[PDB]
Structures are given as structure tokens and as C-alpha cells.
């Protein structure tokens, strides 16, 4: 990882390592351009589960305020999205992907947010453990160090 | 939930990087000691940080002999070598090398390089002192990932 000098290779590594790390159903990188508008840029998904790129998922074309919360280091660890008080529109974004559990960590260095590293469990609800959250978020941070290095180099 | 209050990836000071490497490494492995042996610009290495379990000797409390020049064994680590030694008294080490570790009461010895693109920042080292100990593949991978993360942050300091 530390040696990668290509954006897409980094994103695909993160996504493979993340799913391996958590043994969950899907890991995704939702990456931000300069306007903090985001797109799904990579996905690792267990066989048989829906792939993001096969769906049309609505996503408002502006930077919503949760972007700033992640930028400051918010982590979302949701055991079951149907019990978490999500908006209907948000549930509708995750429904096609058959999400139950939702773990969202920032890929951020010095308050520059490169993206979000996201895990889903689809088969059933899943309580994310502290040590999984720590390891997944260290993976995000390492990926972020190498994304940032791209600019320097 | 929230990212940790201090992150290795957010450190912007050399010595802080070494001290968090050594704290996190000893917690990861639950071993007796973790050190960083860091290289200066002339490839001279120095123990710059240590985290050690209660009751075991501290590196800085000892006089450990160490040839003033860069030895040949350094190149193997620059190139990515890892040494994982279950019991240093049964590993065919030289007497002089044994005498560097005796004062620290080392039995097991794990050595991973802190290296990016052929720049060797140091070695991250773990000791078990209480008993011999066979380092597991999972431990070696995790310890080595920590070392590489530390190396990314040392490198960044140059750029910054
Ligand atoms: C519904 C289209 C929409 C309206 C209208 C609105 O104003 N905002 C939403 C619902 C909404 N969504 C989130 C959080 C996220 N939205 C994401 C967008 C995506 N685009 C995709 O292609 C995709 C498939 C993986 C998604 C999920 C993302 C990445 C997030 C953050 C991750 C997550 O929380 O799922 C919110 C904020 C929820 C909260 O934190 O309060 C809202 C209101
Ligand atoms: C003994 C003074 C000496 C002579 C003479 C010589 O030519 N080389 C040695 C013995 C020797 N040491 C190593 C490898 C290491 N030596 C280290 C130096 C240290 N300085 C310290 O303060 C200290 C306390 C922690 C140490 C251990 C270190 C860090 C190493 C690498 C890590 C390890 O292997 O313990 C060698 C090379 C042996 C090999 O790997 O083939 C030799 C011959």
C-alpha cells in the first residue's frame, strides 16, 4: 500500500483490504473531488450481492453537511440501518444495495477529506466492534497518507 | 463514534512518531519491549525510543557496544528483510550480537524495516524477555504494517 503511486490502485487496494479485514459483504470508497462532491470510485463485494455500479442511486449534487462532520473525524457505526432513524431518502439509497449494517470512516489527513471508507453487512445486522472500527479506520488513514503523497510527488 | 484523539497519521514531529510507534507496537504484540532504531543521514543507527513492560531493563540505562559505522546487515533491511527469532541463543548469532542483547535480557527478537522506496528510516524492533516466543505470521504482518505507516509519516515530514 505504502508504495502505491496511482489513485485508482490505492482505492482498489483499500477496498480489497477492507473487506478482507472485516469479512463483511461490501467495502466501498466514496471519494471527494475539490468541490467535496463525492462518487463511488471502488467496490469489493461478496459474490451474489448487488454492485454499486449496477444501480442508479440518487445523490444530491451539493456537499451535504455530513461531509464536514466526517472531515472533523466523525465515524458512523450502525448495527441496523432500519433501527437507526435514517431518512427515507437515505434508506432508499442503501436499499438497492441491501444494506443492514453500515460502518463509515473518514479518509482524512489534517482535515483534508479524500473520501469515506465504507463497510456494509447485507446478510443481517452487525454490531461493529471497537477493534474493527480502529483497524478499519487505520486502513483508511494509511490509504490517506498515500493519496496525499501523490500530490507531493 | 469518532476517530481517535491522536493518530499516528496526524503526527508532524519525528520524536512523536517514534514514541507512538513504540507504544502502539508494544500494545499490538503485548511483548516485553519495542524499540525504534533510527538511521541518521550517514546510516548510523541509534535507539531513539523504547516502550518496555515493568521490571525489564531500559536500553538507555545500559552501555551497549555498536560499531560506529554502517554494517553490511543494514542492506538486507533496506531491501525489505524481516528477522523473526524465537530464541536468540539458538539462532547462530555472533557472540558480539548476543552481547548487545544480554543486558536487555532478550529471548525472542522481531525486526521489521521502516522503509519506503529504498529509503530506510529505521528498524522497528520487538523483544520478548520473559521467555522464548515464536512470532506468528499475523503478528509479523501487523507489526510490519505499523512500521510502514510510521514510514509514510516520516517521509511526509520531509515534504512538509
Ligand atoms: C437522498 C437521495 C438524499 C437527499 C434528498 C438528501 O438531501 N440527502 C439524502 C439522504 C442522505 N444520505 C446521507 C448519507 C450519505 N449519502 C451517501 C450517498 C451515496 N451515493 C452513492 O452512490 C451511494 C452508494 C454507496 C451512497 C450511499 C453517502 C456515501 C452517505 C454517507 C454514508 C452513509 O451514511 O450511508 C445522509 C446523512 C445521514 C446522516 O449521517 O445523518 C442523508 C440525509
Ligand atoms: C557487536 C558490538 C558487533 C560487532 C563488533 C559487529 O561487527 N557487529 C556486532 C553484532 C551484530 N549486531 C547485529 C545486528 C544489530 N545490531 C544492533 C545494534 C544495537 N544497538 C543497540 O543499542 C541495541 C539495543 C537494542 C542494538 C541491538 C541492531 C539494532 C541490530 C539489528 C537488530 C537485531 O538483529 O538485533 C548484527 C547482524 C546480525 C544479522 O542479522 O546477521 C551483528 C553481526
Write the layout of secondary structure elements.
Two copies of one chain form a homodimer.
Chain A: H1 7-22, E1 26-32, E2 38-45, H2 65-71, E3 76-78, H3 88-94, E4 101-109, E5 112-121, H4 130-152
Antiparallel strand pairs in A: 1-2, 1-5, 3-4, 4-5
Helix pairs in contact in A: 1-4
The complex binds Phycoviolobilin, green light-absorbing form (PVG) (2 copies).
Quick synopsis:
Chain A: Mg(2+) 3 binds at residues 110, 148, 151. The structure is a homodimer. The first copy, chain A, has 153 residues and is an alpha+beta fold.
How many individual helices of chain A?
A: 4
Distance between the termini of chain A: 16 Å
What's the main sheet of chain A like? 5 strands, antiparallel
Q: Secondary-structure element sequence of chain A?
A: HEEHEHEEH
Bound molecules: Phycoviolobilin, green light-absorbing form
Query: Which pair of chains forms the biggest interface, and how many residues does each contribute?
Result: A-B, 26 and 19 residues
Overall number of domains of chain A: 1
Instruction: Count the beta strands of chain A.
Output: 5
Strand order of the largest sheet of chain A: 2-1-5-4-3
Q: Into which percent range does the helicity of residues of chain A fall?
A: 25-40%
- Outline of chain A, from the CA principal axes? globular
Gyration radius of chain A, rounded: 15 Å
CATH fold group of chain A = Beta-Lactamase
Taken as a percent bin, the fraction of beta residues of chain A is 15-25%
Using the coordinates above, name the CATH class of chain A.
Alpha Beta
Oligomer description: homodimer
Give me the CATH architecture of chain A, please. Answer: 2-Layer Sandwich
Structural class of chain A: alpha+beta
Binding site for Mg(2+) 4 (chain B): 155, 158
Subcellular location (chain B): Cell membrane
Protein name (chain B): Methyl-accepting chemotaxis protein
Binding site for Mg(2+) 1 (chain B): 13
Amino acid at each position: 500500500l505504502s508504495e502505491l503511486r496511482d489513485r485508482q490502485a490505492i482505492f482498489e487496494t483499500l477496498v480489497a483490504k477492507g473487506r478482507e479485514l472485516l469479512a463483511c459483504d461490501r467495502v466501498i470508497v466514496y471519494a471527494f473531488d475539490d468541490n467535496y462532491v463525492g462518487t463511488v470510485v471502488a467496490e469489493s463485494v461478496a459474490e451474489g450481492w448487488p454492485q454499486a455500479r449496477d444501480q442508479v442511486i440518487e445523490d444530491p449534487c451539493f456537499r451535504e453537511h455530513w461531509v464536514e462532520a466526517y472531515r472533523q473525524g466523525r465515524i458512523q457505526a450502525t448495527t441496523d440501518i432500519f433501527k437507526a432513524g435514517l431518512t427515507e431518502c437515505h434508506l432508499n439509497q442503501l436499499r438497492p444495495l441491501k444494506v443492514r449494517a453500515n460502518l463509515v470512516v473518514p479518509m482524512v489527513i489534517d482535515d483534508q477529506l479524500f473520501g469515506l471508507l465504507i463497510a456494509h453487512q447485507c446478510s443481517e445486522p452487525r454490531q461493529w466492534q471497537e477493534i474493527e472500527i480502529d483497524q478499519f479506520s487505520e486502513l483508511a488513514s494509511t490509504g490517506s497518507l498515500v493519496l496525499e503523497r501523490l500530490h507531493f510527488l
